[PDB]
Amino acid sequence: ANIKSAKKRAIQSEKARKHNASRRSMMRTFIKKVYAAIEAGDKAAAQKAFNEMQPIVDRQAAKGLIHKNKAARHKANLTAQINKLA
Amino acid sequence: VLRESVGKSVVNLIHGVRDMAAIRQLKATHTDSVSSEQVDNVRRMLLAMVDDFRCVVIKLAERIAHLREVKDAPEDERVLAAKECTNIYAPLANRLGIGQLKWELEDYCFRYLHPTEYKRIAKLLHERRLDREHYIEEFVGHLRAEMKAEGVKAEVYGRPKHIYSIWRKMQKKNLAFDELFDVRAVRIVAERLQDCYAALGIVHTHYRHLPDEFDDYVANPKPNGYQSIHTVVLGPGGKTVEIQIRTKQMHEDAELGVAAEDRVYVFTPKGDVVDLPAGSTPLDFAYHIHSDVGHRCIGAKIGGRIVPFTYQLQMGDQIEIITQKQPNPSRDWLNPNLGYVTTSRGRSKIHAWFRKQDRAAIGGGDIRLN
Amino acid sequence: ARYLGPKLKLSRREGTDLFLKSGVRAIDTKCKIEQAPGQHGARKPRLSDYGVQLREKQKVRRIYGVLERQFRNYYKEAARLKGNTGENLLALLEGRLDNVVYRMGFGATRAEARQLVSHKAIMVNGRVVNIASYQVSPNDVVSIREKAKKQSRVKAALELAEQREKPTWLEVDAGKMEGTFKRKPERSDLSADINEHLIVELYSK
RNA sequence: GCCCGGAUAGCUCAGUUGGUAGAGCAGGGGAUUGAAAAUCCCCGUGUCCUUGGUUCGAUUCCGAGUCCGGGCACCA
RNA sequence: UAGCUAGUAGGUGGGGUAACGGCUCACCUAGGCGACGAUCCCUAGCUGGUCUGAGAGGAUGACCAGCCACACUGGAACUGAGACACGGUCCAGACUCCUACGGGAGGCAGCAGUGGGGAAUAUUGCACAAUGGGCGCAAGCCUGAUGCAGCCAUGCCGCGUGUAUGAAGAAGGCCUUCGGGUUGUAAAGUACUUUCAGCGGGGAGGAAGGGAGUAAAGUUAAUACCUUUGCUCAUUGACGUUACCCGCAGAAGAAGCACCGGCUAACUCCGUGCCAGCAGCCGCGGUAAUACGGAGGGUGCAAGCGUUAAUCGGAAUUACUG
RNA sequence: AAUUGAAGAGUUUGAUCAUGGCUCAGAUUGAACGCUGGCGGCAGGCCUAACACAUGCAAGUCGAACGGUAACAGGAAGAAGCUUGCUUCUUUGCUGACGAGUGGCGGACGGGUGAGUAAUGUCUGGGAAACUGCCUGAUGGAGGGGGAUAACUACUGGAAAC
Numbered sequence A: 001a002n003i004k005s006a007k008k009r010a011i012q013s014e015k016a017r018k019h020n021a022s023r024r025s026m027m028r029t030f031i032k033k034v035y036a037a038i039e040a041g042d043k044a045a046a047q048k049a050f051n052e053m054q055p056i057v058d059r060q061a062a063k064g065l066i067h068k069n070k071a072a073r074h075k076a077n078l079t080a081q082i083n084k085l086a
Numbered sequence B: 001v002l003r004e005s006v007g008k009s010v011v012n013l014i015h016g017v018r019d020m021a022a023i024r025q026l027k028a029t030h031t032d033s034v035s036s037e038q039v040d041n042v043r044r045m046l047l048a049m050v051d052d053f054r055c056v057v058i059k060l061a062e063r064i065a066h067l068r069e070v071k072d073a074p075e076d077e078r079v080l081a082a083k084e085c086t087n088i089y090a091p092l093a094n095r096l097g098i099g100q101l102k103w104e105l106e107d108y109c110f111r112y113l114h115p116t117e118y119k120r121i122a123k124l125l126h127e128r129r130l131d132r133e134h135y136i137e138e139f140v141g142h143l144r145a146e147m148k149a150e151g152v153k154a155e156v157y158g159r160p161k162h163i164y165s166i167w168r169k170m171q172k173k174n175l176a177f178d179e180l181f182d183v184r185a186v187r188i189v190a191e192r193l194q195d196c197y198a199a200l201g202i203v204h205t206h207y208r209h210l211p212d213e214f215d216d217y218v219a220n221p222k223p224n225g226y227q228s229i230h231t232v233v234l235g236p237g238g239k240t241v242e243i244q245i246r247t248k249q250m251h252e253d254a255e256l257g258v259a260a261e262d263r264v265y266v267f268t269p270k271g272d273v274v275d276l277p278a279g280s281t282p283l284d285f286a287y288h289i290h291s292d293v294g295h296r297c298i299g300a301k302i303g304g305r306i307v308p309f310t311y312q313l314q315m316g317d318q319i320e321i322i323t324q325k326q327p328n329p330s331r332d333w334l335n336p337n338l339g340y341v342t343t344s345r346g347r348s349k350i351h352a353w354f355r356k357q358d359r360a361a362i363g364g365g366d367i368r369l370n
Numbered sequence C: 001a002r003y004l005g006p007k008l009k010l011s012r013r014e015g016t017d018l019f020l021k022s023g024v025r026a027i028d029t030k031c032k033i034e035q036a037p038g039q040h041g042a043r044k045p046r047l048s049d050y051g052v053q054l055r056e057k058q059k060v061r062r063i064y065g066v067l068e069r070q071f072r073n074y075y076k077e078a079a080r081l082k083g084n085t086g087e088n089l090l091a092l093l094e095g096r097l098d099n100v101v102y103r104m105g106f107g108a109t110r111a112e113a114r115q116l117v118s119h120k121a122i123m124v125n126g127r128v129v130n131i132a133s134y135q136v137s138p139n140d141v142v143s144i145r146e147k148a149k150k151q152s153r154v155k156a157a158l159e160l161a162e163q164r165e166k167p168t169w170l171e172v173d174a175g176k177m178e179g180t181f182k183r184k185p186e187r188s189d190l191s192a193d194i195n196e197h198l199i200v201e202l203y204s205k
Numbered sequence D: 001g002c003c004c005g006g007a008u009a010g011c012u013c014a015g016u017u018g019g020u021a022g023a024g025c026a027g028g029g030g031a032u033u034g035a036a037a038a039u040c041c042c043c044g045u046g047u048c049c050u051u052g053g054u055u056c057g058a059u060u061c062c063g064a065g066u067c068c069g070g071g072c073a074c075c076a
Numbered sequence E: 001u002a003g004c005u006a007g008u009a010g011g012u013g014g015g016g017u018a019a020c021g022g023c024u025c026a027c028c029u030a031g032g033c034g035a036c037g038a039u040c041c042c043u044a045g046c047u048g049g050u051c052u053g054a055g056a057g058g059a060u061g062a063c064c065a066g067c068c069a070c071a072c073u074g075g076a077a078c079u080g081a082g083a084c085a086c087g088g089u090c091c092a093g094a095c096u097c098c099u100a101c102g103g104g105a106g107g108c109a110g111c112a113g114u115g116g117g118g119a120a121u122a123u124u125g126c127a128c129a130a131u132g133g134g135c136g137c138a139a140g141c142c143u144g145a146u147g148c149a150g151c152c153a154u155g156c157c158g159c160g161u162g163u164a165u166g167a168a169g170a171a172g173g174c175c176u177u178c179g180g181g182u183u184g185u186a187a188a189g190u191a192c193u194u195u196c197a198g199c200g201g202g203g204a205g206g207a208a209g210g211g212a213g214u215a216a217a218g219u220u221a222a223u224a225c226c227u228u229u230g231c232u233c234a235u236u237g238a239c240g241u242u243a244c245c246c247g248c249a250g251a252a253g254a255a256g257c258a259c260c261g262g263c264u265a266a267c268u269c270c271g272u273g274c275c276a277g278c279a280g281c282c283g284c285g286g287u288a289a290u291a292c293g294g295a296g297g298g299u300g301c302a303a304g305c306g307u308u309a310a311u312c313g314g315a316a317u318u319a320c321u322g
Numbered sequence F: 001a002a003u004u005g006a007a008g009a010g011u012u013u014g015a016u017c018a019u020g021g022c023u024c025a026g027a028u029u030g031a032a033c034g035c036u037g038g039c040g041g042c043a044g045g046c047c048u049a050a051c052a053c054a055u056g057c058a059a060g061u062c063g064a065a066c067g068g069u070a071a072c073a074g075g076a077a078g079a080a081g082c083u084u085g086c087u088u089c090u091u092u093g094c095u096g097a098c099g100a101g102u103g104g105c106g107g108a109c110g111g112g113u114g115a116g117u118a119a120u121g122u123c124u125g126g127g128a129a130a131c132u133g134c135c136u137g138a139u140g141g142a143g144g145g146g147g148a149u150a151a152c153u154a155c156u157g158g159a160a161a162c
């Protein structure tokens, strides 16, 4: 990085990246809980998982990490799956 | 053996002084004659001696001691080395800013080149020594007083003119020469550049400057580095009064300068000089340095900046050669019309490479037969 | 840009009078107008069709003082314009400011006129014109500025003009040293020896 | 930087610590044809890289500069 | 180059994407493309256009403008509205540089520039004054975009290089039926003019904005502040001895290249000798050469002219027109 | 008013007509070389090595986002040689401002080149499943808590890079 700005951006990017990864990773984990529940065949549990995670997903979307559409999609798929289950 | 016991500088210095005393005709007419006339010093091999300024400085102190001795003895070559010293060493010293040593040289020379005028302007200097010294101590008195009172502190003194420089002024001012005014000189040597400007203003409050005789050589230094203010005021009994204001540092440089009737000699990154013919290029230089270097020579820098390969090297300027790991000489370098290699040898070397890359019959046959 | 040389040689080569000399003293007495220029002038050449066209082109160019490229450009312009191409070209040639001046009678020859134009002698609508090729449009007045009115050369030119035939499309004043370009010169106004058609043909091969 | 070698008819080459230079081709000139090829005759047709030295006499031997071909050294 | 292709063609479901999608995974069906040329190979940025051409076409894609692609090579993501980012990150590679040898740094296909390659293509120029961009409330700062400047006849265009007169048809040049006739009114001489160049002076336009003071209106508790609209005040130029105008002296400083047998505009005079040379094609040159070299004379173009390369034309010689 | 445009020639032969090639006359260029060579205006200027790159500059800005002051110019409290009047040396972001930083926006534009790509290309025309900073028009919110983190300081690991 020859230009100060680039250097700043680079370090910022690194910092930003670390931040986002943590959030995104967490979100993924949350999703997996729901998915795991679905796989198991535990409906109440699945619902609980969804409840736990949906808000987080929404928050993430709001922040910008994940896109609004993407956030919606997870819910839809998850919603569909849970519905199917019971 | 000098070089073995006192390093390369001291031998370079000894050899330059020996050059420019060119004993050649130091003995050789023995009235000192090529001490005198370079007669192209050791040719233009003056222009293959070492440039180290300590050459000229030991040469000057050598000749100065000699002119002291050429007050006393051998008669008519008192005449000879005085003509050398006027025409060569005194104006050399002056364009170096060694004003002290110009003025001693010139006074010795002149007093055995023209004894009549030397003696006549010497005697004239006594004839008004008293009215001169009295008016100098009254001017220096007033200046010492008002400036000290204003809180400024500096040396303030009179300084005699030297006999050659009086002579000089007398025939570039004949019949408007004044034995009094023209032989007074006030100097002020101040602590700071600030105080030079201050002493200028106080001087000008005490005695009116003359129009057109105010000359700021601190703002525009002369080629031998000479810096001062000059002003001519209108003093209380001297309808001119000459005054030189400066700092200590600029007095030290003004009196002691540098001490503070074919080929082109190119410097190298360290300092080891290389000799090429006139009209040579970077490429040629590279080749001279090493043919492998030439082969691998990418780019030519001169004094930091890049230069075109076609542009010819000027004498003295410092070179740098940017180099590759593989050797790749162009066939364009051989072709002389582009102006890449003036030297024959370099060209030959270049050619050799191509032949190497490439890798009579009758005679052989004859030999076989034999 | 111009032909710096023997004026009458060109005329001789062509055959006809190109008006390259003033006409104070006649062309037939000055040069051997009948004979072609050079050692082999008396040797009458059996001229080819292309050759004749070329000659014609040269004549016209010579008359106006228009070098080849310029001439070509003019021709092209004419072609681009509507109507008879040769006629258009001729008009364009005429429209040249220097030519116009010459016609008026401020230049004895066209060369003189051109020179005058160059030397900021001529004004069009109260504005100086350095350029000889300047196309003088309809209803454009053309004059000499007061600094160049006092020239005897101009007077001489005027006199010559007076002696010679008058153009119809121009109006001119001798005392004031000015005039008016009324309209574009028709084919009937210009000389009939100029076969413009040949020229046109030559710029179609 | 240094050395070694080479520099000869148009052009291939021959001849060297010293005696006015040849072999091939090419060229000439003749007969002969329009001119040729063929055939038949007759013929060197040269700045020995220039300039100096040595010698009773230099292509050659010594310089001195050129030119080319090497083979060596050089690192700013 | 006639066969090609298993994520291959399609399906159900999952996953993914900003988005639809074999985009990817699981399982199933066995397709899909193809002689209206798939596949493989070679070459290629594509378009507006440019050149040429009567057109139709053919060739072509520098400059300017649109779209794509790429950024030392090969990847990869991250950040972000947007990138898988020329002057960001991460890795590997080859290549230069630094290193105390442990490890680092670097990326001109930005503008200059250097080397190299080449037949051949410019200066490490000044400036943000404009126009545009970035940021900011602005002032402003940055802007090698841009604007200008430098270099090169590379092109196009303009202009000039004198104009008028001028027979002794001077001299000299060349020819030569020996008279001249040609250079040629060409030159000299005389008169007249001063483009640009030279000097000295003046002298616009590109400058619209922005800044302070104010007065009114719009906001609000408020005549403050802010915004909007007027006004005077000084301002804002890199180019810049700018464009442009004037005065001075005096033709002064401003013509060359090709061609001249036929094609093809323009011809005479040598040396040589099928030699030297010419040449686009036909062909010139073997002792009288308008073709080779010179001289004069001419012809063509003209600050260019030629040669070469390259395209269309002519070539209806790929014919769609034809 | 807005394509108002179309030429042949030489050369096969003893000569002819025809087929038929080669070939010249034109226009042209990012051109080059040759011989020249006054100037201006407007243009154009690495087509090859997308070969290597020394040097400088080509993207910074915002202090009215935020703690802070690394240089500077002003005041403020204290004092030195005290020209009776402030020059001067110490302290404090209090201010005009600003080094370095965090943050924001910009570095995805602008500029370059044409290597790759005969189609996740281009042109033309159609579309549907999309996102879109700043600019924008509209309709509603902007409450109340946290813990971090550079910056800055001591002790240190590294030749540096860090």
Ligand SMILES: [Mg+2]
Pocket (backbone or CB within 6 Å): none
């Ligand atoms: Mg789905």
Ligand SMILES: [Mg+2]
Pocket (backbone or CB within 6 Å): B332, E118
């Ligand atoms: Mg080259």
Ligand SMILES: [Mg+2]
Pocket (backbone or CB within 6 Å): none
């Ligand atoms: Mg022109």
Ligand SMILES: [Mg+2]
Pocket (backbone or CB within 6 Å): none
């Ligand atoms: Mg699906």
Ligand SMILES: [Mg+2]
Pocket (backbone or CB within 6 Å): E044
């Ligand atoms: Mg390509």
Ligand SMILES: [Mg+2]
Pocket (backbone or CB within 6 Å): E053
């Ligand atoms: Mg056609």
Ligand SMILES: [Mg+2]
Pocket (backbone or CB within 6 Å): none
């Ligand atoms: Mg990449």
Ligand SMILES: [Mg+2]
Pocket (backbone or CB within 6 Å): A065, E080
């Ligand atoms: Mg993102």
Ligand SMILES: [Mg+2]
Pocket (backbone or CB within 6 Å): E086, E087, E108, E110
């Ligand atoms: Mg770069």
Ligand SMILES: [Mg+2]
Pocket (backbone or CB within 6 Å): none
């Ligand atoms: Mg004569």
Ligand SMILES: [Mg+2]
Pocket (backbone or CB within 6 Å): E196
């Ligand atoms: Mg002028």
Ligand SMILES: [Mg+2]
Pocket (backbone or CB within 6 Å): none
């Ligand atoms: Mg003819």
Ligand SMILES: [Mg+2]
Pocket (backbone or CB within 6 Å): E278
């Ligand atoms: Mg010829």
Ligand SMILES: [Mg+2]
Pocket (backbone or CB within 6 Å): none
């Ligand atoms: Mg055709």
Ligand SMILES: [Mg+2]
Pocket (backbone or CB within 6 Å): none
């Ligand atoms: Mg030249």
Ligand SMILES: [Mg+2]
Pocket (backbone or CB within 6 Å): F098
């Ligand atoms: Mg700051």
